[PDB]
Design a binder for this molecule. Structure first.
Ligand code: NI
Ligand code: NI
Ligand code: NI
Ligand code: NI
Lengths: 144, 211
């Protein structure tokens, strides 16, 4: 299975960079395509971390993918899996498997954050995601 | 007095950036050093706000600071104070002649449990003298403000006006308690870093539980 992700909004959040990086490291650059990027986009609009991993991306929609990437299997009516709750990397991780819900992460200094998604468990996160979650977690506090 | 904070963790959380920024604005960039940063740290890892404020940092421990920052006075044995919650002697105004540096030991995880105070003292048994700052936990910026009041202004701990565990109410159904002792300003309000109350308010609007 190959994966297509529509990324239309401008710029790449750190969250998304970590997610796409994990996906690339798990299925490989030949199995992921970003489609429908803003017309503005050139190759320095793309994060260096993603470029280093060989990210396939285009401004064309998913039907223009075979136009831009001649080494890919044609998109046929009715092989590919498209992203128009799980995180995107979790969703892809499970699909790979086939072919814990609302986990609470507890950190140092009495901090904790629960994440509003289902995850795969020996929870699997993109590399660096735990640090990013920690980064937005507020100092030890009590809700009254 | 100069301040050393062991920052022995990857990353800078937003609340930590606000606290460090407040410390830098208060004591100055020449008087704060972050030490024992993860070995992989480069300037690119330091928040832009802190770089612009002149933050000094090193991956070396506190005994490597003088080598990295040649303008600083030497760390001298017995003249470096370690904040120590297990100590009984509070920092007093008379300690101002005794200490040149005040150290916040790193806070590490529970895997495995570590006693950073004992690690530091075992590494450098001639170096550190323990002091307490009262019997209630403070945020780092509050601890530094408190130390300034005691050492610079010569105000004894028992004469500083504090509030313990202030509660910040954002509406009739939501309030947040910060489980720390804070210094009061002259209007009777706890002194928080710029932006911190906003951050607390932002968290209040987000998903949370009360049990
Ligand atoms: Ni309570
Ligand atoms: Ni609430
Ligand atoms: Ni909260
Ligand atoms: Ni919940």
């Amino acid at each position: 299975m190959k994966y297509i992700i529509e990324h239309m909004e401008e710029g790449f959040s750190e969250w998304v960079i970590l997610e796409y990086s994990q996906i690339l490291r798990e299925v490989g650059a030949e199995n992921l395509i970003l489609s429908s990027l803003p017309e503005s986009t050139t190759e320095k609009d793309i994060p260096q971390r993603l470029l280093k991993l060989g990210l396939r991306w285009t401004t064309k929609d998913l039907k223009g993918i075979n136009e831009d990437f001649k080494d890919l299997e044609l998109l046929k009516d009715g092989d590919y899996f498209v992203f128009g709750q799980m995180t995107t990397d979790t969703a892809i991780r499970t699909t790979q498997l086939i072919i814990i819900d609302y986990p609470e992460f507890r950190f140092n200094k009495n901090e904790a954050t629960e994440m509003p998604f289902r995850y795969v468990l020996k929870p699997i996160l993109p590399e660096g995601m735990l640090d990013l979650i920690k980064k937005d977690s507020l100092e030890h506090h009590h809700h009254h």
